[PDB]
Enzyme design. Structure first.
Site, PDB file in Angstrom:
ATOM      1  N   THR A 254       0.821  -1.208   0.000  1.00  0.00           N
ATOM      2  CA  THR A 254       0.000   0.000   0.000  1.00  0.00           C
ATOM      3  C   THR A 254       0.857   1.261   0.000  1.00  0.00           C
ATOM      4  O   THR A 254       0.633   2.170  -0.807  1.00  0.00           O
ATOM      5  CB  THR A 254      -0.943  -0.001   1.204  1.00  0.00           C
ATOM      6  OG1 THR A 254      -0.183   0.153   2.408  1.00  0.00           O
ATOM      7  CG2 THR A 254      -1.720  -1.305   1.266  1.00  0.00           C
ATOM      8  N   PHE A 380      -9.580   5.792   3.029  1.00  0.00           N
ATOM      9  CA  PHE A 380      -9.319   4.812   4.073  1.00  0.00           C
ATOM     10  C   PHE A 380     -10.598   4.225   4.655  1.00  0.00           C
ATOM     11  O   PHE A 380     -10.546   3.560   5.695  1.00  0.00           O
ATOM     12  CB  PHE A 380      -8.482   5.438   5.192  1.00  0.00           C
ATOM     13  CG  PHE A 380      -7.128   5.911   4.750  1.00  0.00           C
ATOM     14  CD1 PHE A 380      -6.035   5.061   4.789  1.00  0.00           C
ATOM     15  CD2 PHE A 380      -6.944   7.210   4.307  1.00  0.00           C
ATOM     16  CE1 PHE A 380      -4.786   5.496   4.389  1.00  0.00           C
ATOM     17  CE2 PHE A 380      -5.699   7.651   3.905  1.00  0.00           C
ATOM     18  CZ  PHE A 380      -4.618   6.792   3.944  1.00  0.00           C
ATOM     19  N   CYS A 387      -9.569   1.940   7.924  1.00  0.00           N
ATOM     20  CA  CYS A 387      -8.166   1.539   7.882  1.00  0.00           C
ATOM     21  C   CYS A 387      -7.532   1.795   9.243  1.00  0.00           C
ATOM     22  O   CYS A 387      -7.352   2.949   9.646  1.00  0.00           O
ATOM     23  CB  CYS A 387      -7.431   2.299   6.783  1.00  0.00           C
ATOM     24  SG  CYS A 387      -5.693   1.838   6.592  1.00  0.00           S
TER      25      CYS A 387
HETATM   26  C1  HEM Z   1      -2.211   4.501   1.433  1.00  0.00           C
HETATM   27  C2  HEM Z   1      -2.281   3.496   2.314  1.00  0.00           C
HETATM   28  C3  HEM Z   1      -3.579   2.740   2.705  1.00  0.00           C
HETATM   29  C4  HEM Z   1      -4.843   2.894   2.260  1.00  0.00           C
HETATM   30  C5  HEM Z   1      -5.387   3.885   1.205  1.00  0.00           C
HETATM   31  C6  HEM Z   1      -5.681   1.936   2.954  1.00  0.00           C
HETATM   32  C7  HEM Z   1      -7.040   1.773   2.781  1.00  0.00           C
HETATM   33  C8  HEM Z   1      -7.858   0.938   3.512  1.00  0.00           C
HETATM   34  C9  HEM Z   1      -9.292   0.797   3.356  1.00  0.00           C
HETATM   35  C10 HEM Z   1     -10.161   1.568   2.338  1.00  0.00           C
HETATM   36  C11 HEM Z   1      -9.722  -0.104   4.246  1.00  0.00           C
HETATM   37  C12 HEM Z   1     -11.179  -0.577   4.440  1.00  0.00           C
HETATM   38  C13 HEM Z   1     -11.992   0.493   5.162  1.00  0.00           C
HETATM   39  C14 HEM Z   1     -13.450   0.115   5.143  1.00  0.00           C
HETATM   40  O1  HEM Z   1     -13.772  -1.013   4.687  1.00  0.00           O
HETATM   41  O2  HEM Z   1     -14.290   0.942   5.580  1.00  0.00           O
HETATM   42  C15 HEM Z   1      -8.575  -0.576   4.995  1.00  0.00           C
HETATM   43  C16 HEM Z   1      -8.591  -1.512   6.008  1.00  0.00           C
HETATM   44  C17 HEM Z   1      -7.489  -1.983   6.690  1.00  0.00           C
HETATM   45  N1  HEM Z   1      -6.210  -1.460   6.631  1.00  0.00           N
HETATM   46 FE1  HEM Z   1      -5.539  -0.130   5.225  1.00  0.00          FE
HETATM   47  N2  HEM Z   1      -4.886   1.213   3.820  1.00  0.00           N
HETATM   48  C18 HEM Z   1      -3.592   1.679   3.694  1.00  0.00           C
HETATM   49  C19 HEM Z   1      -2.498   1.214   4.393  1.00  0.00           C
HETATM   50  C20 HEM Z   1      -2.522   0.338   5.457  1.00  0.00           C
HETATM   51  C21 HEM Z   1      -1.410   0.024   6.329  1.00  0.00           C
HETATM   52  C22 HEM Z   1       0.012   0.618   6.226  1.00  0.00           C
HETATM   53  C23 HEM Z   1      -1.819  -0.863   7.240  1.00  0.00           C
HETATM   54  C24 HEM Z   1      -0.904  -1.440   8.349  1.00  0.00           C
HETATM   55  C25 HEM Z   1      -1.322  -2.340   9.245  1.00  0.00           C
HETATM   56  C26 HEM Z   1      -3.223  -1.154   6.979  1.00  0.00           C
HETATM   57  C27 HEM Z   1      -4.049  -2.016   7.671  1.00  0.00           C
HETATM   58  C28 HEM Z   1      -5.397  -2.216   7.456  1.00  0.00           C
HETATM   59  C29 HEM Z   1      -6.215  -3.253   8.053  1.00  0.00           C
HETATM   60  C30 HEM Z   1      -5.729  -4.332   9.044  1.00  0.00           C
HETATM   61  C31 HEM Z   1      -7.462  -3.116   7.595  1.00  0.00           C
HETATM   62  C32 HEM Z   1      -8.670  -4.002   7.968  1.00  0.00           C
HETATM   63  C33 HEM Z   1      -9.361  -3.398   9.186  1.00  0.00           C
HETATM   64  C34 HEM Z   1     -10.531  -4.253   9.596  1.00  0.00           C
HETATM   65  O3  HEM Z   1     -10.883  -5.196   8.841  1.00  0.00           O
HETATM   66  O4  HEM Z   1     -11.108  -3.993  10.682  1.00  0.00           O
HETATM   67  N3  HEM Z   1      -3.609  -0.400   5.885  1.00  0.00           N
HETATM   68  N4  HEM Z   1      -7.456   0.085   4.522  1.00  0.00           N
HETATM   69  C1  LIG Z   2      -9.986  -8.218  -4.744  1.00  0.00           C
HETATM   70  C2  LIG Z   2     -10.470  -9.595  -4.229  1.00  0.00           C
HETATM   71  C3  LIG Z   2     -11.718  -9.937  -5.029  1.00  0.00           C
HETATM   72  C4  LIG Z   2      -9.348 -10.610  -4.531  1.00  0.00           C
HETATM   73  O1  LIG Z   2     -10.763  -9.636  -2.827  1.00  0.00           O
HETATM   74  C5  LIG Z   2     -10.054  -8.916  -1.873  1.00  0.00           C
HETATM   75  O2  LIG Z   2      -8.878  -9.242  -1.684  1.00  0.00           O
HETATM   76  N1  LIG Z   2     -10.735  -8.075  -0.981  1.00  0.00           N
HETATM   77  C6  LIG Z   2     -10.533  -8.048   0.498  1.00  0.00           C
HETATM   78  C7  LIG Z   2     -10.988  -9.444   1.072  1.00  0.00           C
HETATM   79  S1  LIG Z   2      -9.616 -10.428   1.861  1.00  0.00           S
HETATM   80  C8  LIG Z   2      -7.914  -9.760   1.379  1.00  0.00           C
HETATM   81  C9  LIG Z   2      -7.002 -10.906   0.860  1.00  0.00           C
HETATM   82  C10 LIG Z   2      -5.506 -10.759   1.134  1.00  0.00           C
HETATM   83  C11 LIG Z   2      -4.649 -10.003   0.317  1.00  0.00           C
HETATM   84  C12 LIG Z   2      -3.283  -9.885   0.596  1.00  0.00           C
HETATM   85  C13 LIG Z   2      -2.726 -10.516   1.703  1.00  0.00           C
HETATM   86  C14 LIG Z   2      -3.559 -11.267   2.521  1.00  0.00           C
HETATM   87  C15 LIG Z   2      -4.918 -11.378   2.233  1.00  0.00           C
HETATM   88  C16 LIG Z   2      -7.350  -9.034   2.616  1.00  0.00           C
HETATM   89  O3  LIG Z   2      -7.655  -9.419   3.761  1.00  0.00           O
HETATM   90  N2  LIG Z   2      -6.489  -7.947   2.506  1.00  0.00           N
HETATM   91  C17 LIG Z   2      -5.896  -7.189   3.643  1.00  0.00           C
HETATM   92  C18 LIG Z   2      -4.670  -6.330   3.194  1.00  0.00           C
HETATM   93  C19 LIG Z   2      -4.437  -5.036   4.014  1.00  0.00           C
HETATM   94  C20 LIG Z   2      -4.740  -3.738   3.280  1.00  0.00           C
HETATM   95  C21 LIG Z   2      -4.770  -3.612   1.887  1.00  0.00           C
HETATM   96  C22 LIG Z   2      -5.059  -2.391   1.267  1.00  0.00           C
HETATM   97  C23 LIG Z   2      -5.322  -1.275   2.065  1.00  0.00           C
HETATM   98  N3  LIG Z   2      -5.304  -1.353   3.416  1.00  0.00           N
HETATM   99  C24 LIG Z   2      -5.024  -2.549   3.982  1.00  0.00           C
HETATM  100  C25 LIG Z   2     -11.319  -6.896   1.213  1.00  0.00           C
HETATM  101  C26 LIG Z   2     -10.531  -5.630   1.517  1.00  0.00           C
HETATM  102  C27 LIG Z   2     -10.035  -4.826   0.494  1.00  0.00           C
HETATM  103  C28 LIG Z   2      -9.308  -3.658   0.741  1.00  0.00           C
HETATM  104  C29 LIG Z   2      -9.052  -3.253   2.044  1.00  0.00           C
HETATM  105  C30 LIG Z   2      -9.537  -4.037   3.085  1.00  0.00           C
HETATM  106  C31 LIG Z   2     -10.263  -5.204   2.824  1.00  0.00           C
END
Ligand code: HEM
Ligand SMILES: CC(C)(C)OC(=O)N[C@H](CS[C@H](Cc1ccccc1)C(=O)NCCCc1cccnc1)Cc1ccccc1
Ligand code: HEM
Ligand SMILES: CC(C)(C)OC(=O)N[C@H](CS[C@H](Cc1ccccc1)C(=O)NCCCc1cccnc1)Cc1ccccc1
Lengths: 441, 454
Positions: A254, A380, A387
């Site tokens: 990311t 985010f 996020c």
């Molecule tokens: C430019 C950088 C990043 C962007 C734009 C981004 C974007 C997002 C978005 C859109 C979601 C889902 C929010 C929702 O469904 O309402 C998410 C979830 C998440 N992000 Fe990121 N992310 C970034 C970087 C990171 C980083 C550096 C981490 C480090 C741990 C991270 C950890 C997570 C996790 C664990 C979730 C899942 C949270 C949950 O399922 O409760 N992300 N992110």
């Molecule tokens: C695109 C498609 C149809 C294939 O399905 C998704 O992969 N879709 C996810 C569901 S599972 C996803 C699977 C995965 C990917 C890489 C490593 C391990 C598991 C998952 O857990 N990735 C978490 C990565 C953390 C992150 C990545 C980007 C931004 N911030 C945080 C739903 C989802 C999409 C985007 C953000 C959060 C959840």
């Protein structure tokens, strides 16, 4: 089950049997959302196989799904499998296990813990300048995602585990090949339990068996790893590995990809890159090391990152699963319908942004940011399940922007794909890699 | 010390021993700043006793003080005392304390918080229309400061604490009666003219527990906020301070609450009275404003967040009134170290002042600056407006944190009132309006107007 949206009076494209509306993905997720954003209006429904997906654009309805009715109705995302042992991932966890993991990994990125990470990232900010100086004294176009991926890998492996890994590092090589066949899971949701009880996964075994063995080597008995052991003394050992893979992948794929998106815009907009270097030299003269206070002070740096995240939302969409029959904002959503929020289509909606195609940082200025709906611009996400590493990602990307713009300038090359064509496939990436010229200062 | 501006070649009125240039305040802050802007030019300097005050009028010089060199040089305002425990207030905090309090209170007025407050303000709007209808059916001129201050007290106490204190009016509500006497700065009163000019008299009063605010209004607001803690029982201004407390102090919570209660009452009602004075004295502007509200909100449609941001002429009327009447009048910053901005050296300790009143009426920036012309802020002419000459809410990191809240509460009042009533002058209406020749920006005689129903 495909006459659902015809019953509820919600418009949408005519789905095909079994496939649904997946054949319209030939231009990508973003192009399909924007075409349906204009054809049908504010609310439309389509099918991903037999899974009904309802797209909403009303900010009041978006707030009710993300923020208001989170713990009650819209709690979990789309069921993603088969994942094997990765079912315990916080990004894929559901209901009670998610709240336990969300509250267990929340103190990872507090203002105090983030302040401790600044000296750690300050070390990796110097090697980034030194490696870019080698490619600056020698006229050679730089593959930015490569060197940014190495910088993004060292930060998340140190600010979360305290281990130093330092061009063919097996982590970056393994973490990148989670990047096809999913066309089946959208069409066979019943094949997900076919591989669960019989223990088949989608992730390649080698990228998981290595990371499962690497976390065990990391288990050298306040870090992100130190939090998961003090909370274990109930956290499982295999659940501990699943959370690390998510943090390792999110810290690498990311941050480096968005950093590559920022440098392309600055090189293609010289006056924007010049105005940012002048502000950095004003707040931090003599190439002074950046601090937590000086990163948040640079507002034009924040206006550039917020504009790039508007044009390039790497998540593209936001998905929530309606777990019971509800009615929000005068609209009935049945149980099981995946409520989707097109972040890409809303970030470029002509009825919310003037010239949504061009790179204009003036949108996020304090004079004009009051005209931006926080539920239309969701890079985010929002609500209790946004996020969790949002404040960590915004800090790490700005620390790289400050430390590099103090020493170099970026100009396009001959092979620089102008304009940058996004990958017409799944995740948000450019078709051709982002390459730019680096000139020392 | 009165030869500082003579050394720097900066013009200005000749100061007197001890008093300095305070005796030129016989007409007020505004008249003194406008006389100096015409005689000395773009930059002049005077003395509030022995404290040298450098006045700047250049947009690049104002942008450098308020925006550019804020965190490094021009961070704090003039030291105001004695204040006692009110020193922890965000408007008076300095350096790291203000930086901690500013970020702690910024999420109070976001786009989501302000959109949540609209149904709460809409409740008090109907009570305002009802009370304005009693004094309308009977031909009685209305003291607008009274009926708008009660409305302003209802809105700011509910949207920040969730408590309803004023109910049906209650023309003797204690909050309005105690907040109106919280601070009445006057020169004819010695105490303030006693200080201000002399600063070697602030630390004595601090050890005597002597404060510029009377103990009656502080001890009441100390126990009223303490009674305003009802949890267990939304997320408002009070909820943000407790969640951040769990390092915020208890008495510091009352300090920031007193500022929010005063700003929500005095600023909102005083500007509203200035707006209604221009609407009654200009029936064409009031008519054109009433037609825009009926177009966006037909059949007396309730105002919403999105419909408020659509009315342009409503924004033009508020902006022109804030131009003629900037309630802050001045913008002051303290130079904490020797600097050279825009090719001008400013010594350490000099109070950099921006005469907002004199700049809003500068003939070389506004054509006919004394005439109420809302067309200045139209989208055809708003591009011809410098954002550092017209600063009704200040500029930079230490601007008015309740700007977007004050603009909404005044517009939500102007909409629901002008939907039902029209305003005309009376015999006892002071035309033209004479501003108070004292300290704070107020009219001499209260703004009184007749209220006719539609
Ligand atoms: C430019 C950088 C990043 C962007 C734009 C981004 C974007 C997002 C978005 C859109 C979601 C889902 C929010 C929702 O469904 O309402 C998410 C979830 C998440 N992000 Fe990121 N992310 C970034 C970087 C990171 C980083 C550096 C981490 C480090 C741990 C991270 C950890 C997570 C996790 C664990 C979730 C899942 C949270 C949950 O399922 O409760 N992300 N992110
Ligand atoms: C695109 C498609 C149809 C294939 O399905 C998704 O992969 N879709 C996810 C569901 S599972 C996803 C699977 C995965 C990917 C890489 C490593 C391990 C598991 C998952 O857990 N990735 C978490 C990565 C953390 C992150 C990545 C980007 C931004 N911030 C945080 C739903 C989802 C999409 C985007 C953000 C959060 C959840
Ligand atoms: C018409 C209404 C108002 C006007 C014209 C106004 C004007 C101003 C101005 C000019 C400043 C100084 C800016 C600077 O020095 O750069 C200021 C500061 C301030 N205002 Fe207002 N104001 C209004 C209403 C309000 C409201 C409703 C609140 C609610 C909390 C409020 C709270 C504050 C605070 C706390 C400060 C100090 C900020 C700081 O020191 O960081 N004001 N106001
Ligand atoms: C006339 C004199 C000397 C007092 O001169 C100022 O008035 N000078 C202020 C200094 S301390 C001021 C004192 C005070 C007054 C009433 C209640 C409590 C304290 C102060 O803190 N009031 C904050 C009120 C909030 C407000 C008021 C108006 C507009 N918006 C917000 C410096 C100052 C001026 C303008 C805005 C912020 C600070």
């Amino acid at each position: 089950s495909h006459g659902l949206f015809k019953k509820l009076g919600i418009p949408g494209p005519t789905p095909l049997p079994f496939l649904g509306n997946i054949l319209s993905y030939h231009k990508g997720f973003c192009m399909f959302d924007m075409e349906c954003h204009k054809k049908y209006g504010k609310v439309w429904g389509f099918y991903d196989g037999q899974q009904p997906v309802l797209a909403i654009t009303d900010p009041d309805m978006i707030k009710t799904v993300l923020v208001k009715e989170c713990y009650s109705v819209f709690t979990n995302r789309r069921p993603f499998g088969p994942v094997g042992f990765m079912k315990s991932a916080i990004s894929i966890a559901e209901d009670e296990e998610w709240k336990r993991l969300r509250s267990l990994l929340s103190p990872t990125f507090t203002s105090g813990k983030l302040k401790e990470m600044v000296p750690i990232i300050a070390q990796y900010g110097d090697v980034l300048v030194r490696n870019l100086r080698r490619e600056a004294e020698t006229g050679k176009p730089v593959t930015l995602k490569d060197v940014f991926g190495a910088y993004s890998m060292d930060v998340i492996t140190s600010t979360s585990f305290g281990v130093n890994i330092d061009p063919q590092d097996p982590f970056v090589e393994n973490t990148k090949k989670l990047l096809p066949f999913f066309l089946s899971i959208t069409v066979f949701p019943f094949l997900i339990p076919i591989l669960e009880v019989l223990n088949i996964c989608v992730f390649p075994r080698e990228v998981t068996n290595f990371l499962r063995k690497s976390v065990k080597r990391m288990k050298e008995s306040v870090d992100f790893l130190q939090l998961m052991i003090d909370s274990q003394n109930a956290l499982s050992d295999l659940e501990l590995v699943a959370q690390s893979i998510i943090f390792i992948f999110a810290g690498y794929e990311t941050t480096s990809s968005v950093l590559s998106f920022i440098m392309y815009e600055l090189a293609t907009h010289p006056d924007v890159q010049q105005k940012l270097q002048e502000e950095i030299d004003a707040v931090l003269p003599n190439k002074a090391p950046p601090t937590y206070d000086t990163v948040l002070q640079m507002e034009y740096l924040d206006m550039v990152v917020n504009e790039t995240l508007r044009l390039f939302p790497i998540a593209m969409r936001l998905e929530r699963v309606c777990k019971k029959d509800v009615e929000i904002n005068g609209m009935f959503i049945p149980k099981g319908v995946v409520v989707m929020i097109p972040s890409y289509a809303l970030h470029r909606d002509p009825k919310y942004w003037t010239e949504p195609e061009k790179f204009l940082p003036e949108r996020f200025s304090k004079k004009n940011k009051d005209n931006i709906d926080p539920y239309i611009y969701t890079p985010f996400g929002s609500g209790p399940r946004n996020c969790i590493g949002m404040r960590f990602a915004l800090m790490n990307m700005k620390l790289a922007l400050i430390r590099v713009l103090q020493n170099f300038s970026f100009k396009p090359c001959k092979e620089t794909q102008i304009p940058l064509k996004l990958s017409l496939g799944g995740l948000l990436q450019p078709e051709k890699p982002v390459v730019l010229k680096v000139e020392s200062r």
